[PDB]
Amino acid sequence: MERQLEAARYRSDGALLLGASSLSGRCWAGSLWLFKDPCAAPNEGFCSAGVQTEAGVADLTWVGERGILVASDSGAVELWELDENETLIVSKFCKYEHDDIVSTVSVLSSGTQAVSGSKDICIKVWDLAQQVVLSSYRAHAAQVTCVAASPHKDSVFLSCSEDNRILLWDTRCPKPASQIGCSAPGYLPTSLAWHPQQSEVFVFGDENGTVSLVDTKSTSCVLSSAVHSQCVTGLVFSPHSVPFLASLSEDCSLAVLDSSLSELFRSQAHRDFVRDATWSPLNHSLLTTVGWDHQVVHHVVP
């Protein structure tokens, strides 16, 4: 395998998808791995399926149950399907339509369309059936850091870039994007996460370690907490009816927060960057985190 674990995602049935990159050494490639035994990860020999990719992977996501969407360093978006009773990972398509590293992808509510953000400052909307790009928006002025589809509308999604802009999109408007900034000169946003139940509300992390909760229609920062000492890389809500919020940072710590952003659980178990995290659909009290230390940690959450 490769040293730097980048992505970890649970499927509906409880299988663990893993996306890894090699960021040092002779070859700077990437790989995709599927573990029907999630406790046997990362070990390559005890995996259900695996595949080597041309270049490293920056972001990953499921396309339903058999599909895997990959943002590549090559500037391409790749769709890989699970084949042969889930022992193979074959490339469905791989389109080179960005001009720089694709840093984020997000599947929309329908599941037939997706949206990607790259370092070429462009955001793109993809039709996963036709394998073509529908729309290409140059809304930002710096490399796009994160894009996050709204859970139930596939015309709505958030995006944050290093031009210090947080855009709420609505592809039904002739000017789709809308700038919705908290206060005024806030630190650069890094990670975006919609709230599972409460629609029109979301959370974003900045490069300073602050996680903030914001309502769209109210467009005012109702609350924010300084959770991490360094940049916030990801935010995942739990499948609970009262969702917990998992915050990942480059200070190598995992934090779990309530709806008022108070610290409930904290893990120093990773000795390198914490890159992704997913909750188990079977057991809603188990949380799986992967890091650049090649560790796959399973936390119990009270």
Binding site: S21, G56, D99, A142, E207
Partner: protein
Amino acid sequence: RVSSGRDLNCVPEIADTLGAVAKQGFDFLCMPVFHPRFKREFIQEPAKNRPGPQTRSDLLLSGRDWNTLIVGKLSPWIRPDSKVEKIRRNSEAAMLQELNFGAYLGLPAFLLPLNQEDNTNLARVLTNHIHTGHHSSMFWMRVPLVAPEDLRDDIIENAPTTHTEEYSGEEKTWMWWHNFRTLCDYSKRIAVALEIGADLPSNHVIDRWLGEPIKAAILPTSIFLTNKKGFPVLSKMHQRLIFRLLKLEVQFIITGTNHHSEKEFCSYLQYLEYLSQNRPPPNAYELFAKGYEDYLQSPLQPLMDNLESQTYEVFEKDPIKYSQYQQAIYKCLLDRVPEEEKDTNVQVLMVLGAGRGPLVNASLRAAKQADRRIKLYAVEKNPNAVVTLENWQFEEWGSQVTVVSSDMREWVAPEKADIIVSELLGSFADNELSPECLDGAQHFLKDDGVSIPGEYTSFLAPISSSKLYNEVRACREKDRDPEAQFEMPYVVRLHNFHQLSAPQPCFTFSHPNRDPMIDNNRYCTLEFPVEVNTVLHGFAGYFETVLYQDITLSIRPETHSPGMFSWFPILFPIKQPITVREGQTICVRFWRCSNSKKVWYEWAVTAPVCSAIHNPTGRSYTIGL
């Protein structure tokens, strides 16, 4: 053809990638020396102690390959001017790390971006790195021709693009560079890699990059249109810009993926090669002066020094000039001797400053063409060229030519002359003391005699060239005034520069100067309207001259004699560059001074700001009498 390069932010295996870009036809590759996404920590544990290695090994390529083919790229996560103190310090350390690794590899260049107005701490770190090591590196600053903020699509409903005339705002990107370039004290190892977007800005924004040290021009695959067959091509304005850049001899860097998937990746580059090869092929002048471009030379002083044989050889290999001289002499002969007197009247014709005798042969051709008699004197003070003159006279000319080996100011001629002919003109007309020599020679000119040339006038024009300014600055020498190089002119084929106003006449001299109170000193005040924002670095100097009636020579670009390559323009620099905003007038003053032994120029800028008076008392530059 074009010297091209390929920019990539994805290199899985460096050997395969370099081989592929070599097959595609590129000459070099820009790539990251660390993985772009491989952010690193230096202060805070635990990520501080991350087990290595931190990037690839240097053994993967040969030292020759590192020296010639690879251009480094600063990782995009390094932000030395972040508002966050933590990120600030960490990015300082990371930038030092990557610069030092690039120096360890011996790369010929390293790319750093300018994406905002404030790059102060970045400039601090880069200047430090420059002034520490023993390396021989070059640093390309990636600057967008149009800032991404001013190039975004108007698709933000609540933050629209202001469609209002913003003259200075559209130039903001240049200011970025100009501040950075200034903070690093005009370092010669810091150049520009100008990136070009799909929408080209106003012409004055593109003119803002004239005179700037552009080593590379970056083309994304996005800006390429498609024709009928499917090839990638460029618009007409993009093509104009490409030709302008080709004359600056920049290297072209292709970036972005291939969106013309039917064609190969060498199609983008082939289009550049096609633009290059199908440009107006070089004429004789540009052929000769191609290597002389922006090459500083001290002006010749043929009065103070005896010119070498090959300097005269350069002077003589110029047909247009001597054709004009022959025509002037021909007309003057016809105007002084009527047809009925053609055999009873033989004109006396003295070449003052004859060199190896091209003017003598031209005078012979003029007389033979006009059917008139002439008696020739060939006055020349340089005895080494008098050797050539006398061999010519013994072998070919005969007693028709009388070779005189003395100074024209000293020589006591036997008879007075009908026509005196000279080419004592410099790039600044009088900067080789033609007026003083012809003044001293006026006493053996007949009361109604003619001087060829009869008139000459120097011209000045303010220019901007942070490249030529840096060259002049580099001309500092031990054992003299540390700023003496700014207080002296230079003969140079000005190339990478920007004319800030139309040339205007400076000093004019007539011959013969019958005036009783002869005085060749001068004081001239010039006002140049400047309708652009710019930075004054010096003044270009040209000249025009009337040989006879309407036969003239000129190096003034607007009236330049076509295909004449004997003179290059002159350049008067100034110690401190002077910012000039649009609408302001540049007011300069120029003096011509002299005593018994020396002649020199003094000059000063009086508007919009005042400069120091340059070369006072000829301390840095004199012209010997």
